[PDB]
Ligand binder design. Structure first.
Ligand SMILES: Nc1ccc(S(=O)(=O)N(CCNCCN(Cc2ccccc2)S(=O)(=O)c2ccc(N)cc2)Cc2ccccc2)cc1
Ligand SMILES: [Cl-]
Ligand SMILES: [Cl-]
Lengths: 99, 99
């Protein structure tokens, strides 16, 4: 698809069998999702936002679909204003910026 | 151009006679740059997300050039950890997300 930016690039993702809205964020190195239950073990991760660094939970090798495109990768969980898809999964699905 | 997302999508901008480096950020509504002088009137604004909010100065109708493309728009100025180009200017250069 081609997505313009006149509105927020919000899309439907699927994770854990659930559909959710998420923001495609080229500014984000990593994917950060609102608190949810995920399987397996998690590790600690410090991420830097505009208002400073915060602690989130890192789950690896998780299945997630983005606009129907299937991915398996790292997902962080913590207090984000909205689910964000960052470059780790944007690259997997073959996303680029174009002008 | 077609900008990969393997790396942070950083470009050179020119603003207020200054040349700066800035992150193309589809997740940001508006452009925010580290402390600098800009001409004209401004109004205070709070922006935030991860790790908090910061106070910024909002300048409207500012001329900027991004990769040779000239655009006009709102520029927020404040203690952002990294210079960010937001959707409000990404649209003007015809930037889209593609996959
Ligand atoms: N006008 C304007 C208003 C707000 C913002 S923002 O606060 O940057 N923002 C846009 C998301 N940018 C992602 C990068 N992040 C930090 C940043 C800050 C400054 C420079 C580079 C990197 S981040 O903190 O959001 C982040 C950090 C790490 C990961 N993995 C994901 C997101 C708000 C938002 C956060 C999350 C969800 C929805 C919305 C920018 C401009
Ligand atoms: Cl911890
Ligand atoms: Cl990953």
């Amino acid at each position: 698809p081609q997505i313009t930016l006149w509105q927020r690039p919000l899309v439907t993702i699927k994770i854990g069998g659930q559909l959710k809205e998420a923001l495609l964020d080229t500014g984000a190195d990593d994917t950060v999702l609102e608190e949810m239950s995920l399987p397996g073990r998690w590790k600690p991760k410090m991420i830097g936002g505009i208002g400073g660094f915060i602690k989130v939970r890192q789950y690896d090798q998780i299945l997630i679909e983005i606009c129907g495109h299937k991915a398996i990768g790292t997902v962080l969980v913590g207090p984000t204003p909205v689910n964000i898809i960052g470059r780790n999964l944007l690259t997997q699905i073959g996303c680029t910026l174009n002008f």
